[PDB]
Amino acid sequence: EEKEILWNEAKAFIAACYQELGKAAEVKDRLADIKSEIDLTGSYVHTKEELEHGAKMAWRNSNRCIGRLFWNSLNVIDRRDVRTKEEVRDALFHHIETATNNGKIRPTITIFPPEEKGEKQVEIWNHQLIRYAGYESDGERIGDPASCSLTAACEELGWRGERTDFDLLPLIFRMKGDEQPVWYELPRSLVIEVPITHPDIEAFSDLELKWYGVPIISDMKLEVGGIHYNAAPFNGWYMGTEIGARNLADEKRYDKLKKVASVIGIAADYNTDLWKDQALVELNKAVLHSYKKQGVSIVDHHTAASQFKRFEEQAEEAGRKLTGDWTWLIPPISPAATHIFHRSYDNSIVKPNYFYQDKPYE
Amino acid sequence: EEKEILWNEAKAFIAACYQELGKAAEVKDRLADIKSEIDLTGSYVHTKEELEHGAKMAWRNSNRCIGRLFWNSLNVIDRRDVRTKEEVRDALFHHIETATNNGKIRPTITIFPPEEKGEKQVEIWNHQLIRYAGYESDGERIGDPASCSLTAACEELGWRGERTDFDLLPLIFRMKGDEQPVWYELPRSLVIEVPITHPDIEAFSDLELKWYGVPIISDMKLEVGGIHYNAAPFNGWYMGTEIGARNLADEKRYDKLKKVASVIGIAADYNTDLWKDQALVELNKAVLHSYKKQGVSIVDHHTAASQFKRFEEQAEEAGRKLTGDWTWLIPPISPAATHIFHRSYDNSIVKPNYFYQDKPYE
Ligand code: HEM
Ligand code: HEM
Ligand SMILES: Nc1ccc2ccc(CCNCCc3cccc(F)c3)cc2n1
Ligand SMILES: Nc1ccc2ccc(CCNCCc3cccc(F)c3)cc2n1
Ligand SMILES: Nc1ccc2ccc(CCNCCc3cccc(F)c3)cc2n1
Ligand SMILES: Nc1ccc2ccc(CCNCCc3cccc(F)c3)cc2n1
Ligand SMILES: [Cl-]
Ligand SMILES: [Cl-]
């Protein structure tokens, strides 16, 4: 019965994958092999080629992602061989180093052993591999509010943050068999951070803002042909608005707009002055400038949408249906200046894909 | 059968309307009267109270409208008595004058006789009562591109535009029985326009931009209890982004961002400079400033969203379900600075409401 769902998904993925790889003649035999592997074992194991192409398809099918033009150049690291927490740790350290690539960010995914019985082999607690802690007590807010629950769970495990606004959370994950996760402090040498300065407002550095170089999302499940890779961290480079319009701007995040308005020398008193809008534009300019100045990859939302238009065109040329989530594809600043805003998208879910899964804490 | 749809809609509207008006005891008799009016006549006629409250409900149910807090103060003009094109014309002139109110804009709707057999009594061709013409020929673009087809239809009827970028289209409508619409030039004394200047960039006036004071949407059908008022022009005041982020900004409209960038003294060469975003903010500041300076009502998108939050709260307090279209409710600049962006809305259609209908030209 679960053998059935698995087999069905397998037939559909293998057929599609092999067509795309020009290997359509090998399908029958491969499905035969898989069919008996499922009977005898309960599961099946992807070839390296299948796993690589599956991860790329999953990115291509991610409706909410504007960065999909580059789906076929995803760097896929196969870590299905790991068995120990030291190996997991070192694989995560390695992912950080190789994805960072001295600033010339490589889109990368590291794939850990998949769920067996729905039983996880490796369970990653981090939302992203590099992320700042958050604290709230006594009406005192420090750091990133979105990290409050994970921060508190880490401090239950004997970690202690310095309570700066930018404490790096340790890696935290649990191995099958263990009742508790282990945690490891990130080596600072591995983590590139970018101080935020503005191209012509010198006082902007007074805000002492920074952000980390590489977003490495580590809590989503990659699903490929019925196999559930719950631990499969991946990264791209940032689109600047993620940092300047949301992480640093949102009232429930770092909430910096009023401070930005002050350092750029504008009043923050009247809605009709559009001071929040002006502050947003200057903060977003500063973020792009700062990343570029430091030699860390980043994309602005106009260039990103132009790339996404090419992705739409490429999909059409290939005979593939395009799917998308308009509400996530439009950027949070000047959305109507992009073509995305002016068209609609079919939000159907196609697999392989990346999926949310329940947090193991909270 | 059509008598059936009508009766059903009637039962539902009358029940709801009278509950809201504290008149629940009068429903049975009123429905009885309506029931036989439908049998004998094929239709029924709203009382003035029903028509007024119905128009207000229709605004309250308009999913795409951020301005709904003020639904209950809609000024409803009952023009079901009109029979001639001179009366229609004068009613439209009157709507302009009274809605404008010397700049202190009154949200108003003028309701004309409804469809009878699905046969229109009055068919308005204008999209808005005040709107600029558009021309395209020989790769020459003049005025508002969105008005190109209506402009060409008017010029088929013997009207001729001066081919400025801001020619006012004449009122154009057709009476039942007539094969062609008639058109009437707007009296310039009735039409307030606002020149666009910037609060501190003096050269902004070099763009010679302007826009009209009052958006009076004249091509939607108001539906109330099964009765179809295809001709029922209404207006609010503008939210500034409608003008500065869309009408003046869109590449398929006045396409002014590159000219804005030049007059504000910034380069328009690199996406990463976010020059379009900065241009958008300055243009939008200029629009709000200009309207305010001239004493014409307008709302900025932050204040508008704050009002809409109060509308959500009021709906909850009243026990009414809230409906909305997130994709139209978010403003086209700094949307993530509004609460709207951070929640979802049920996009169900509730009646009474306003609906699209097919254009009578093109
Ligand atoms: C190469 C640079 C990349 C850029 C610039 C980019 C850009 C973005 C942006 C802006 C979002 C929306 C985020 C938000 O609003 O919070 C997003 C969502 C997403 N991206 Fe990409 N992305 C890139 C690479 C990748 C890669 C390599 C993958 C996976 C292999 C991926 C998968 C996704 C997924 C799954 C989401 C949706 C996450 C969710 O629903 O919470 N992206 N991307
Ligand atoms: C009082 C000031 C008002 C403001 C500031 C306001 C604001 C807006 C805005 C910004 C939109 C979106 C327009 C677009 O993106 O093109 C909108 C849509 C709409 N508004 Fe309002 N509005 C107001 C009054 C009214 C009134 C009086 C009515 C009717 C009685 C109305 C009915 C609607 C409808 C039906 C739509 C959707 C139109 C469509 O689907 O094309 N609004 N409103
Ligand atoms: N630039 C990129 C590349 C890949 C991405 C993949 C996923 C995401 C979305 C991450 N945010 C999900 C929603 C969320 C979750 C947890 C905390 C938050 F503040 C927000 C952003 C990405 N950005
Ligand atoms: N003229 C306008 C004004 C406001 C607009 C606001 C948004 C849009 C986007 C059109 N894309 C719609 C996405 C969508 C809409 C409705 C249902 C969906 F599932 C998805 C177009 C607009 N055009
Ligand atoms: N401020 C207001 C008040 C009422 C409104 C009622 C309706 C509308 C939407 C009008 N635009 C509809 C889409 C459209 C149609 C025709 C030409 C266009 F450029 C765009 C805007 C409103 N704005
Ligand atoms: N953390 C983030 C990042 C991007 C976002 C982008 C958009 C939103 C809006 C949530 N509202 C969704 C509206 C919607 C979504 C999906 C289907 C619908 F019918 C309507 C929240 C976001 N949160
Ligand atoms: Cl992020
Ligand atoms: Cl308009």
Chain B residue with the nearest C-alpha to that of A290: B272
Helix (H, G, I), strand (E, B) or coil at B208: coil
Name the strand (E) or helix (H) holding B45.
Answer: none
CB-CB contact of A123 with A174 (8 Å): yes
Sequence-ordered list of residues with C-beta below 8 angstroms from that of B232, at least 6 positions apart, any chain: B55, B109, B110, B111, B112, B220, B221, B222
Which atom, in ligand 1's list, is nearest to the CA of A304?
Answer: 5
Name the token pair of A168: 């790096």
Task: Out of B274, B300, B332, name the one closest to residue A274 (CB).
Answer: B300
For the CA atoms of chain B, what is the radius of gyration?
22
Neighbours of B151 (CB within 10 A): 25
Rounded Cα–Cα distance for residues A232 and A234 (Å): 6
Residue nearest to atom 20 of ligand 5 (CA): B146
Helix and strand numbers, DSSP H then E, in chain B: 10, 16
Residues sharing a CB contact under 8 Å with residue B202, sequence separation 6 or more, in sequence order: none
* Tokens describing residue A112: 């850990």
The four Cα atoms B96, B97, B101, B104 give a dihedral, to 10 degrees, of 20
Nearest to B123 by CA among B330, B359, B348: B359
The class that CATH gives domain A81-106+121-192+356-360 is alpha beta
Task: Give the largest CA-CA distance in chain B.
Answer: 71
Q: Which of B246, B271, B334 lies at the smallest CB-CB distance from A276? A: B334
How is A271-292 classified by DSSP, letter by letter? Answer: GGGTHHHHHHHHHHHHHHHHHH
Three-state DSSP class for B140?
strand
Closest by Cβ to A280, choosing from B285, B332, B337: B337
Burial class (CB in 10 A: 0-12, 13-18, 19+), A222: buried
Can you read off the two tokens belonging to residue A286?
Answer: 């500063």
Q: Is B274 on the interface with A (CB under 8 A)?
A: yes
What is the sign of the dihedral through the CA atoms of A161, A162, A163 and A165? negative
* Interface contact flag, A333 B285, Cβ < 8 Å: no
Query: For the residues of B158-198, what is the DSSP string, one character each?
Result: T------TTPBPPEEEEETT-SS-EEEPPPGGG--EEE---
Residue B146 to residue B136: CA distance in whole angstroms? 11
Nearest to A16 by CA among A317, A310, A319: A319
Contact yes or no for B303 and A271 at CB 8 A: yes
CATH of B193-215+238-303, one of 3.40.1000.10, 3.90.1230.10, 3.20.20.70, 3.40.50.450: 3.90.1230.10
Is some CB atom of chain B closer than 8 A to the CB atom of A277? yes
End-to-end Cα, chain A, rounded Å: 32
Q: How far is CA B322 from CA B69, B306, B310, B316, in A?
A: 12, 16, 12, 8
Please list, in sequence order, all residues whose beta carbon lies within 8 angstroms of the beta carbon of residue A115, skipping any fewer than 6 positions away: A121, A228, A229, A230
CB-CB contact of A264 with A279 (8 Å)? yes
Q: Do the beta carbons of residue A235 and residue A104 sit within 8 Å?
A: no
Specify the 3-state DSSP secondary structure of B33: helix
Domain A1-80+107-117+221-235+305-329 is in which class? alpha beta
- Whole-number Cα distances in Å, A261 to A3, A199, A203, A207, B267: 59, 16, 11, 11, 22
Question: What is the residue extent of each domain of chain B?
Answer: 1-80+107-117+221-235+305-329, 81-106+121-192+356-360, 193-215+238-303
Does B302 lie at the interface with A, CB-CB under 8 angstroms? yes
Residue with structure tokens 């949200």?
B107
Q: CB count, 10 Å around CB of A289?
A: 21
Find tokens 């990115």 and name the residue. Answer: A59
Residue of B159, B242, B326, B328 with catalytic role:
B242
Q: Which of A330, A327, A326, A334 is nearest to B241 (CA)?
A: A334
Mapped onto helix, strand or coil, the DSSP state of residue A146 is helix
Q: Does A250 touch chain B (CB under 8 A)?
A: yes
As a whole number of angstroms, the distance between CA A65 and CA A91 comes to 25
3-state secondary structure of B15: helix
* Known catalytic residue at B183: no
**A247: which DSSP letter?**
I
DSSP H or E segment with residue A195: strand A193-195
The 8-class DSSP code of residue B127 comes to S
Here the contacts of A285-288 (C-beta below 8 Å, separation 24 or greater) are A285/A198, A285/A199, A285/B273, A285/B274, A285/B278, A286/A196, A286/A197, A286/A198, A286/A199, A286/A201, A286/A204, A286/A244, A287/A196, A287/A211, A287/A240, A287/A243, A287/A244, A287/A248, A288/A240, A288/A244, A288/B272, A288/B274
Q: Which helix (H) or strand (E) holds A254?
A: none
Q: What's the token pair of residue A315?
A: 């999909």
Nearest CA-CA partner of B283 in B251, B256, B244, B253: B244
Closest Cα to atom 18 of ligand 6: B344
- Expressed in angstroms and rounded, the spacing between residue A242 Cα and the centre of ligand 7 is 6
The verdict on a CB contact (< 8 Å) between A337 and B300 is: no
CB-CB contact of A184 with A171 (8 Å): yes
Task: Collapse the DSSP code of A219 into the 3-class scheme (helix H, G, I; strand E, B; otherwise coil) and give the result.
Answer: coil
Q: Kindly report the backbone phi and psi dihedral angles of residue B193, in degrees, each rounded to the nearest multiple of 5, phi listed first.
A: -125, 155
How is B241-303 classified by DSSP, letter by letter? HIIIIIITT-TTTT--HHHHHHHTT---S-GGGTHHHHHHHHHHHHHHHHHHHTT--EE-HHH
Q: Give long-range contacts, CB 8 A cutoff, 24+ apart: A58-61.
A: A58/A222, A58/A223, A58/A224, A58/A351, A58/A352, A58/A353, A58/A354, A59/A234, A59/A354, A61/A323, A61/A349, A61/A350, A61/A351, A61/A352, A61/A353
The answer to whether B333 contacts chain A (CB < 8 Å) is yes
d(CA A171, CA A341): 37
What single-letter amino acid sits at B294?
Answer: Q
Percentages of chain A per state (helix, strand, coil), in multiples of 5: 45, 15, 40
Give SS3 for A8: helix
Q: Cβ contacts (< 8 Å) between A284 and chain B: which residues?
A: 274, 277
What resolution, expressed in A, was reported for this entry? 1.8
Q: Does B246 sit within 8 Å of A274, measured CB to CB? A: no
How far is residue A319 CA from its own chain's centroid? Answer: 28
- Going from the Cα of A130 to the center of ligand 6, the distance in angstroms, rounded, reads 24
What single DSSP character describes residue A132? Answer: B
Hey, is B54 helix, strand or coil?
helix
Cα of B356 to ligand 6 centre, how many Å? Answer: 26
- Please name which of B307, B63, B134, B108 lies closest in space to residue B215, comparing C-alpha atoms: B108
Instruction: Kindly report the backbone phi and psi dihedral angles of residue B168, in degrees, each rounded to the nearest multiple of 5, phi listed first.
Output: -80, 130
Q: How many CA atoms lie within 13 A of A284 on its CB side?
A: 30
Marked catalytic residue, from B30, B50, B59, B68: B68
* Nearest CB to A300 within list B274, B278, B280: B274
Beta bridge partners of B78: B111
Count CB atoms within 10 A of the CB of residue A184: 17
Structure tokens that stand for A204 in this block: 């902007």
* Cβ contacts from A onto B, under 8 A: 88
Rounded distance between C-alpha atoms, residue A334 and residue A304, angstroms: 13
For chain A, the farthest-separated pair of C-alpha atoms sits apart, in whole angstroms, at 71
* Catalytic annotation present for B2: no
Scanning every residue of chain B, which has its alpha carbon at the shortest distance from the alpha carbon of A247? B336
Q: Are strands A353-355 and A221-224 parallel, antiparallel or unpaired?
A: antiparallel
Rounded to 10°, the helix A2-20/A27-41 angle is: 160
Q: Fold identical between A1-80+107-117+221-235+305-329 and A193-215+238-303?
A: no
Q: Which residues of B, range 198-227, sit inside 8 Å of A by Cβ?
A: none
> Scanning the structure block, which residue is given the tokens 């004449």?
B170
> Residue A243 and residue A289: Cα distance in Å, rounded?
12
Task: Map residue A40 onto helix, strand or coil.
Answer: helix
Ligand-binding annotation for A65, yes or no, is yes
